[PDB]
Design an enzyme around this catalytic site. Structure first.
Site, mmCIF file in Angstrom:
data_model
loop_
_atom_site.group_PDB
_atom_site.id
_atom_site.type_symbol
_atom_site.label_atom_id
_atom_site.label_comp_id
_atom_site.label_asym_id
_atom_site.label_seq_id
_atom_site.Cartn_x
_atom_site.Cartn_y
_atom_site.Cartn_z
ATOM 1 N N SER D 57 0.937 -1.110 0.000
ATOM 2 C CA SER D 57 0.000 0.000 0.000
ATOM 3 C C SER D 57 0.974 1.154 0.000
ATOM 4 O O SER D 57 0.706 2.211 -0.587
ATOM 5 C CB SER D 57 -0.859 0.056 1.291
ATOM 6 N N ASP D 352 -0.463 8.078 8.308
ATOM 7 C CA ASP D 352 -0.901 7.631 9.612
ATOM 8 C C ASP D 352 0.273 6.907 10.229
ATOM 9 O O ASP D 352 1.351 6.882 9.651
ATOM 10 C CB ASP D 352 -2.136 6.731 9.529
ATOM 11 N N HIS D 355 2.123 4.339 7.521
ATOM 12 C CA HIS D 355 2.423 4.573 6.114
ATOM 13 C C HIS D 355 3.188 5.849 5.836
ATOM 14 O O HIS D 355 2.797 6.922 6.271
ATOM 15 C CB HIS D 355 1.132 4.584 5.312
#
Ligand SMILES: *[C@@H]1O[C@H](CO)[C@@H](O[C@@H]2O[C@H](CO)[C@@H](O[C@@H]3O[C@H](CO)[C@@H](O)[C@H](O)[C@@H]3O)[C@H](O)[C@H]2NC(C)=O)[C@H](O)[C@H]1NC(C)=O
Ligand SMILES: *[C@@H]1O[C@H](CO)[C@@H](O[C@H]2O[C@H](CO)[C@@H](O[C@H]3O[C@H](CO)[C@@H](O)[C@H](O)[C@@H]3O)[C@H](O)[C@H]2NC(C)=O)[C@H](O)[C@H]1NC(C)=O
Ligand SMILES: *[C@@H]1O[C@H](CO)[C@@H](O[C@H]2O[C@H](CO)[C@@H](O[C@H]3O[C@H](CO)[C@@H](O)[C@H](O)[C@@H]3O)[C@H](O)[C@H]2NC(C)=O)[C@H](O)[C@H]1NC(C)=O
Ligand SMILES: *[C@@H]1O[C@H](CO)[C@@H](O[C@H]2O[C@H](CO)[C@@H](O[C@H]3O[C@H](CO)[C@@H](O)[C@H](O)[C@@H]3O)[C@H](O)[C@H]2NC(C)=O)[C@H](O)[C@H]1NC(C)=O
Ligand SMILES: *[C@H]1O[C@H](CO)[C@@H](O[C@@H]2O[C@H](CO)[C@@H](O[C@@H]3O[C@H](CO)[C@@H](O)[C@H](O)[C@@H]3O)[C@H](O)[C@H]2NC(C)=O)[C@H](O)[C@H]1NC(C)=O
Ligand SMILES: *[C@H]1O[C@H](CO)[C@@H](O[C@@H]2O[C@H](CO)[C@@H](O[C@@H]3O[C@H](CO)[C@@H](O)[C@H](O)[C@@H]3O)[C@H](O)[C@H]2NC(C)=O)[C@H](O)[C@H]1NC(C)=O
Ligand SMILES: *[C@H]1O[C@H](CO)[C@@H](O[C@@H]2O[C@H](CO)[C@@H](O[C@@H]3O[C@H](CO)[C@@H](O)[C@H](O)[C@@H]3O)[C@H](O)[C@H]2NC(C)=O)[C@H](O)[C@H]1NC(C)=O
Lengths: 427, 162, 162, 427, 162, 427
Positions: D57, D352, D355
């Site tokens: 991600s 956050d 990440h």
């Protein structure tokens, strides 16, 4: 007055003309840039602190008649892990009476000088008359696995589980018991009265580690009885002989199944034992066999496979009197990575007929110095980059190259007279 | 070349005659072309030759083996390879060899020019220096005595105009 | 060498004195051996030195990596090898280095001879040029004025007639 | 007049004497021919068009909070084939709820930065509490096979045939169903009432090809239940547990046969699942197992073995809060060909907590440039042939060599004075 | 440098004029700077040039392939390697190339100095040799005849004694 | 009076300035130090006495219409061991009628030019319509094993033991008998009347030696019948088809067991034969099969594994008229060590339409000279170290390297003018 003086450059016959880049030179003498180097015959090492040896008695420092009995100096013996009367093979099977020494250790370069202690002379026979072949294969693997591990150690006992019908066995040929590694086990079974035992299943576990030592790969011996034929086997056994080693899943990794392969013995009424060398990853293995006999593996040599390295193997024989063998020799020469050391003259020891032979000594003397290169053709601690004959294959370090004495470049010497340009030289 | 006796530029090739560094003298009304060594002048060249020869040892020793480190465990023969590797290293050596010879050569000659200057720097009487290495003095002013002083160097019977 | 103000053949080693290219003058009835730089004559050498130093950069830059292309996926250590490969490449570099220094050296000296010729080519009055790099003029004919013209180069009180 | 001018060469103490071939040089300054080069820490590549990455991600370009959430630039993300919440391992077993992404693609150099998504945190347990070991081995193979193939792709479904007695199974621990890869299947069997099912046999086919992708070798997972012991097994099962995978001929390629190997469980009344990594050539395999359970393999990763290539693997962990693992690390370091990238400082993300960590970013920044060499010791895009410390093993390209700063050759600088011949230099 | 005609030290660059080794003459009260080749003096240089050019062939032929012997059975592409191996061997060749050119250069020049000496060694009348390669004779003593003898070499009408 | 002569060095435009170490050179012409070398297309060798070829008819010296029919010279034919109408593959299975030649011999370099003789044209079918695939794999192994052995030989017969229920079989498709290698054997069995034979067990022995030849490894063919399904098989057979080859212990080394693997045929009521290539160490193997049929292996190619070496394989096809195949081509290209030789134009023979094609001749002409290097890209006997295009992978010897014509160094030529020091060059 009408004279004429001149600084003259004159060259006669005792000359030679070395040409160079940007002017030449006439010279009276000439010599080689480098000298051809001969390889010192014998065994040596590099780093001196990255090597270890596995010993006999000829290396056993803590032996009674020391200096005498040794084939090596003290300095060297210090780096050896030996014990009079031992042999890696002896420890592998632990035959009765013979010394069982825990060989183990680490080193980038391993030097083996053991074996003689289980030569034909030893006249050991535990269901097998001529052990040489096995010796050969056993050695062959020790060297292979040794040349790929950093550390290696005998594993004198492993987690196993034996069935109840079977009970420890003793044998006539095996003095009066049996080998320690292939372990005999038996159960009362008489075909005549139609009493065939219970086919047995037993487990055993090759450990991931053994003390300090990490085992990435195990060398175990898969053994079985070779019968001449059914009826012969059926004399003392009930259906068809067989011994098989399966892996975690039922994959077979070794053995002999006379329920599908033919009987091939020729020793008459009693079998012959055959021992195969197997390399097994660590784990839980099982074995199945015909009721009467079970030859359970219970020992092994354990190798991490950490790193590659050289291996020197010294030939091990008796002085005259007792029968020796060339298993070692054969094995070294048949495996990449080890260098074999052999004697030209026979063995005649100082301590006694079998310990402290001169040749061997001047052979293993190199183990005391640091060489620039070591090959199957010998070692060299000198520095020139050339040699007369091509050094032999297993070789490590900065080995010189082959070149005809003539072909090496020459340096002018003696009287030097610089030449100028072109037709400068006039006769 | 300079008649029968040439300068520090050329080199006499006499298959069977004397050999080395020497003093070649000849008069204009003379057939005898004297050749003789002045071991006192040589004293420089000779020592310098040593200093020079000394260097080779160093530079040769200095050849830190353009030699390979092997881990050949396989048994297959490699002569066709070892051979080619050798033919090359041999070649590499050859060049760096000529490199030495030439340097020596250069320094030696440059050292012979060191003598001239020094010999030339020995009188306005001598100071004839025609071609390099060759000079024509007048024995009426420069008798053997100074000739020997000028060249050979016996240190007896000069001529300072002061 | 020669006394104390050696020619363009030798080189003065004075651990604690001045350093560089300079004009060494001395009279026959004088103890004072004047040493002084003629930054106007140097003007050539200096610039040529630059041109020379410039070449190195090129040739060095020119060293198109006698450096290997690897596809080493295996994890085993190779220092004993990397090391030996380096010791060699180092050596290779050394030679080609000396090759540069020598060339420079050669070209520089050949360039000091360019001055002499030029200085010598400055009068029959001067035209004494004894040993190479050294000359003896007569200050009775060649007063400081031309000496300075001859060497240093002030362009005042030289040579008219024509 | 009786003067004397001389172009003089004078050298004092601020000198230095560089000697050369054919004349020397005195100099005031000196400098190195080449400068020692430092390796830039992190990951990079060569060719820039011969590489491909498999993403998380932190690499997912099409993620909501993009730039922020990323650990890489856009340029780089473009070369990645990721999808938030994915993991090669997740796709391998397709556990319930967790994202199942079709990872596949080609490249001479493959860069992996996935895994965190199935860390201890994920708290998945489908008959197995600590999946790390498996993660380890799975990764281990992916890397190996990856470093030998040019193309690789998940094979999300393969031709199989399941028996009739057995019917799809669901499990308590497995949320309320089961994994997608090891596929549970069961049949009603109650030993008490003496109703033991029909030992099952099922087939399955590893394809030669999967779309564009050519499969020369398949990585499949062989799993089985580990019971504590017979009786325990005999609680819900009838004879002796076993699951085995045979090949075209009855050769076994994997499994567990408790009819010959001992029971080794210690999870009390319910079993534990074990999953072995298997490399199988394409073909038709079959599996046999005790009636009650059948864990049928139904997916795999397929590799052509077309060509060798480098592999970079970035460590994957959580920011603080959730439990992470080093399977990746361990695996990369234990397989030839892949280079591991690790962080020194912890993870603290911009988007956050998990990440967009700075370190990682300046670590994977290299993926944007073309290096001259890449090693497990870092990469370098500079050009000198030397470096201070030895670059680490897995390395590709034109890597510089180790050399002491001193030992490198020196170039004359500043004021140059040519030396002549021999005693040219006089005091 | 100098006037329209320089010595054996420099080299004239005339993008569109004649080219080669030639005799550059000029008077002090003259604007016409005659340039002309003396194919009889060239006779040496020319032949020496051959001798020189000859050497290359040898030394080049002499390059005993610093070329590798292969036993590449694997099919994987190695261009990235073959290429790097080539870039290197190319480099090695370059240096040994320059080594040749320089040597030639050196020997050729040293050979031009062989002429001077020889030309200079042709009369005390000539014996003006100012700068190296350049000399100033007096055509009142040295008419064309000997000029031609001195240089060009027609062997008719010169000499200072016998 | 006041003249001035000067030996002048003048350079115009027809110049070029080659710089060197210690002085430069102006020149009128320039040339390359070495010339780029082109590879001669075709096959050649080195040593000329270390090579051997296995032939067809196009190589058969003792053929009726000789020179004409040949694709090679006599000199070459002499080094070949051929026999008109032969094919290693033909000798492997010995089909009926087709020539069975004992190919065998030694050499560091082996050149194969056989195969056409068993192309689709041959229209052989002994329970198999399209043999090409098999040809492929057979060739593939020959080449592999060939490139690792020094000596190789067909083993036309090996020690075997066939059971009694079974008796030699003959087949319709197989002209009216059967192949010699996979040997058919059968026993009367009629399921209808419920008479199923006796499952058979037969042994066979791969020898350690075969005449001069030492066998370290055997290439045998494991064959079996592929039925569409049970019932179909059950038409003529009783339970479930199966043929398996076990090793000394019951380890399986090959075959097909339809008792665990699914039926995969599609040839309707009659089976199809499948032949796998197997590499077996020498020893006593056994095979077991369903009563009705037994396909006993009875031949093999034996390789010592003494040493590595090159392998050239020439493509073998028919002139136009009959159908050819590219098994050889495919195989060569798919195995390390062999170099494939192919024609661009079709085959048109001199002797007749199929023998003595021009192209092939000028292709195999190299076999007469000694090359400096041989590659999959062609060979070269010239001496420069450079070439325009990169030579292809399987290559042996001193192969030139790729380099742009320009990039090679230049030598001064024509008129040479030495440059002096720095600003020596002036206008
Ligand atoms: C008899 O069997 C052989 C082997 O099974 C068949 O030969 C193979 O035929 C196929 C199709 O003609 C070839 O594969 C194709 O390759 C091309 C390019 O490489 C590609 O475009 C296609 O998609 C396909 O992959 C293959 O090369 C060929 N192999 C050999 C050694 O010739 C043959 O077709 C069968 N003959 C009959 C009559 O069924
Ligand atoms: C660098 O340049 C040198 C000249 O300054 C090279 O030298 C070459 O010149 C000599 C003459 O002095 C050649 O001699 C040839 O002729 C004689 C007499 O007939 C023969 O006896 C001899 O065999 C030769 O054929 C040299 O041969 C020639 N080169 C060499 C290598 O000898 C000098 O060689 C050159 N340096 C290098 C490294 O090439
Ligand atoms: C080529 O030849 C040179 C001579 O022209 C070599 O140089 C050597 O000569 C110098 C004199 O200029 C020596 O200098 C003195 O001091 C050194 C201290 O290091 C002593 O070793 C030496 O005996 C003298 O007393 C140089 O030392 C000496 N060589 C070196 C390396 O310094 C020059 O080296 C040589 N070129 C090559 C590449 O070898
Ligand atoms: C050894 O040293 C030589 C000098 O003595 C090198 O040569 C050089 O010759 C001239 C003078 O340095 C250079 O010219 C440069 O400047 C002029 C300005 O007019 C330009 O026109 C020209 O293009 C150059 O930029 C040469 O370039 C230089 N040659 C080289 C190759 O750099 C000689 O090269 C050196 N030896 C070696 C092997 O490099
Ligand atoms: C031409 O070649 C050499 C040139 O030196 C001549 O031989 C030389 O002869 C001398 C003696 O006359 C040798 O000297 C030897 O060492 C010392 C002096 O260095 C001396 O005391 C010893 O007695 C000894 O003779 C010199 O080394 C030797 N060199 C060689 C190469 O032989 C040779 O004689 C000359 N040819 C002619 C015809 O003169
Ligand atoms: C012996 O060696 C050199 C001879 O030149 C001396 O070092 C040099 O000293 C001069 C001083 O005159 C320095 O000059 C300076 O140059 C800078 C520009 O670079 C300029 O800005 C200053 O005004 C000054 O003129 C020169 O740089 C320096 N060079 C080095 C390498 O040190 C040295 O001192 C001499 N020793 C004696 C006792 O003369
Ligand atoms: C600038 O210099 C170059 C180099 O000398 C000149 O080229 C040269 O031109 C001459 C013409 O006189 C050529 O010489 C002739 O060669 C033929 C060959 O068949 C020969 O039969 C004649 O006897 C004569 O020697 C010479 O080969 C040629 N050299 C080169 C390298 O091209 C050029 O002409 C000069 N430019 C000017 C305006 O003078």
């Amino acid at each position: 007055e009408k004279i004429k003086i001149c600084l003259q450059k004159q060259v006669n016959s005792s000359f030679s003309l070395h040409n160079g880049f940007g002017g030449n030179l006439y010279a009276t003498e000439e010599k080689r840039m480098f000298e051809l180097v001969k390889p010192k015959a014998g065994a040596s090492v590099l780093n001196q602190s990255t090597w270890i040896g596995f010993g006999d008695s000829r290396t056993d420092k803590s032996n009674s008649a020391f200096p005498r009995s040794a084939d090596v100096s003290a300095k060297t013996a210090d780096k050896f892990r030996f014990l009079s009367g031992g042999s890696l093979m002896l420890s592998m099977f632990g035959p009765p009476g013979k010394v069982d020494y825990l060989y183990q250790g680490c080193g980038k370069h391993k030097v083996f000088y053991e074996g003689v202690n289980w030569s034909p002379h030893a006249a050991i026979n535990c269901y097998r008359k001529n052990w040489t072949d096995i010796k050969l294969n056993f050695q062959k693997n020790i060297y292979e696995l040794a040349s790929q591990s950093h550390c290696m150690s005998l594993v004198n006992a492993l987690d196993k589980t034996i069935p109840l019908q079977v009970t420890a066995g003793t044998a006539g040929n095996c003095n009066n018991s049996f080998l320690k590694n292939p372990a005999l086990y038996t159960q009362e079974v008489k075909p005549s009265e139609n009493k065939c035992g219970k086919e047995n299943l037993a487990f055993f576990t090759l450990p991931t580690q053994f003390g300090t030592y990490e085992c990435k790969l195990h060398l175990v011996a898969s053994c079985y009885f070779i019968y001449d034929s059914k009826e012969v086997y059926n004399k003392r056994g009930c259906d068809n002989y067989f011994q098989v080693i399966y892996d975690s899943f039922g994959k077979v990794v070794g053995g002999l199944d006379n329920r599908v392969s033919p009987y091939t013995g020729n020793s008459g009424d009693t079998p012959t034992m055959q021992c195969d060398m197997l390399q097994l990853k660590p784990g839980r293995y099982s074995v199945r066999s015909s009721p009467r006999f079970l030859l359970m593996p219970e020992r092994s040599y354990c190798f991490d496979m950490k790193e590659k390295g050289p291996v020197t193997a010294v030939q091990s024989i008796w002085g005259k009197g007792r029968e020796s063998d060339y298993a070692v020799d054969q094995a070294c020469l048949s495996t990449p990575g080890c260098m074999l050391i052999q004697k030209q003259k026979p063995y005649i020891g100082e301590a006694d007929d079998h310990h402290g032979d001169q040749e061997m000594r001047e052979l293993l003397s190199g183990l005391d110095y640091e060489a620039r290169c070591i090959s199957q053709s010998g070692w060299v601690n000198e520095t020139s980059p050339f040699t007369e004959k091509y050094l032999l294959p297993p070789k490590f370090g900065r080995c010189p190259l082959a070149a005809k004495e003539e072909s090496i470049p020459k340096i002018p010497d003696g009287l030097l007279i610089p030449t100028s340009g072109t037709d400068t030289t006039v006769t | 070349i300079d008649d029968l006796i040439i300068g520090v530029l050329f080199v006499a090739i006499v298959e069977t005659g004397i050999g080395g560094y020497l003093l070649g003298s000849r008069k204009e009304s003379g057939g005898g072309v004297t050749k003789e060594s002045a071991e006192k002048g040589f004293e420089k060249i000779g020592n310098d030759i040593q200093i020079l020869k000394s260097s080779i040892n160093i530079a040769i020793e200095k050849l830190n083996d353009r030699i390979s480190h092997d881990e050949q465990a396989i048994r297959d023969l490699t002569l066709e390879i070892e051979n080619a590797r050798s033919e090359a290293l041999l070649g590499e050596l050859g060049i760096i060899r000529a490199l030495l010879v030439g340097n020596i050569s250069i320094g030696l000659q440059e050292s012979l020019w060191e003598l001239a200057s020094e010999i030339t720097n020995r009188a306005g009487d001598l100071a004839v220096e025609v071609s390099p290495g060759c000079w024509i003095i007048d024995n009426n002013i420069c008798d053997q005595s100074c000739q020997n002083f000028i060249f050979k160097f016996n240190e007896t019977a000069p001529v300072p105009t002061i």
